Amino acid sequence: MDIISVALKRHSTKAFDASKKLTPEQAEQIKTLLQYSPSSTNSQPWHFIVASTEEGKARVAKSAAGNYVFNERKMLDASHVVVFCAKTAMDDVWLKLVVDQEDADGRFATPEAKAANDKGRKFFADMHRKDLHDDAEWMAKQVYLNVGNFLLGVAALGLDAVPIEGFDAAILDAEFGLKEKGYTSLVVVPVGHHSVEDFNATLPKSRLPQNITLTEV
């Protein structure tokens, strides 16, 4: 199906059917989407928690407390639930892991080619960590980009999903000990098939007119 039709027809699912699970093939496909998203300098400043078991989804759902109880059932009824996490700080060890992996994958023709890439990555990494002091935000933006790629991708797979910011990140981070591991949760994305209670499945989509948001030059 044409990608624009996918974009115009997908929606944020409000209720999922707990008896409908992803096929083993789709389960593998969503992980592929997560891994291959692009990122600034191929920095991949992220970690993903994919909850597919009843106990796993229950642990994530704990973060939907208080003013967020409305998002709890979404996390519990979906087939799979993805927690998008961003590193809390950019360290040289990670920078080395990335360029060594690119080297292992065969992207460099010579040693100086690898040296240049690393020097380049380091340059922009330091601009954010040392000059602007905003590497935390910088990395989080990369995670949000991944989320955007993911939502369109799952929709193109014929699966329902919903992006969720309505959860307590302090609770979720603690539930999985993310802080001490060097990460923090940003977005939760339940994936599966919608249920009869998905009131948003029949409502028309709505966006501002391009005459407001877009300028052609």
Ligand X SMILES: O=C(O)c1cccnc1
Ligand Y SMILES: Cc1cc2nc3c(=O)[nH]c(=O)nc-3n(C[C@H](O)[C@H](O)[C@H](O)COP(=O)(O)O)c2cc1C
CB of 40 to ligand Y, least distance (A): 4
Q: Which helix or strand (DSSP H or E) is residue 47 part of? A: strand 46-51
For residue 165, indicate whether it is catalytic: yes
Cα(213)–Cα(36) distance, rounded to whole angstroms? 30
Cα(170)–Cα(178) distance, rounded to whole angstroms? 10
CB of 8 to its own copies, least distance (A): 6
Segment 136 to 175, residues that bind its own copies, using CB under 8 A: 137, 140-142, 144-153, 156-157, 163, 165-166
Cα(171)–Cα(70) distance, rounded to whole angstroms? 16
Nearest Cα neighbor of 143 from 20, 49, 22 is 49
Task: Take residue 185 and report the two structure tokens written for it.
Answer: 């949760």
The annotation status of 73 as a binding-site residue, yes or no, is: no
Number of residues lying near ligand X (CB under 6 A): 5
For ligand Y, the binding residues (CB under 6 A) are 11-12, 14, 38-42, 71, 145, 162-166, 187, 200, 205
- Catalytic residue, from 28, 165, 179, 197: name it: 165
For residue 87, indicate whether it is catalytic: no
Q: What residue type is assigned to position 36 of the chain?
A: Y
Choose between 22 and 189: whose C-beta lies nearer to ligand X: 189
For residue 14, indicate whether it is catalytic: yes
Cα(142)–Cα(184) distance, rounded to whole angstroms? 13
Give the interface with ligand X as residue ranges (CB under 6 A): 40-41, 124, 165-166
**Which residues carry out catalysis?**
14, 74, 165
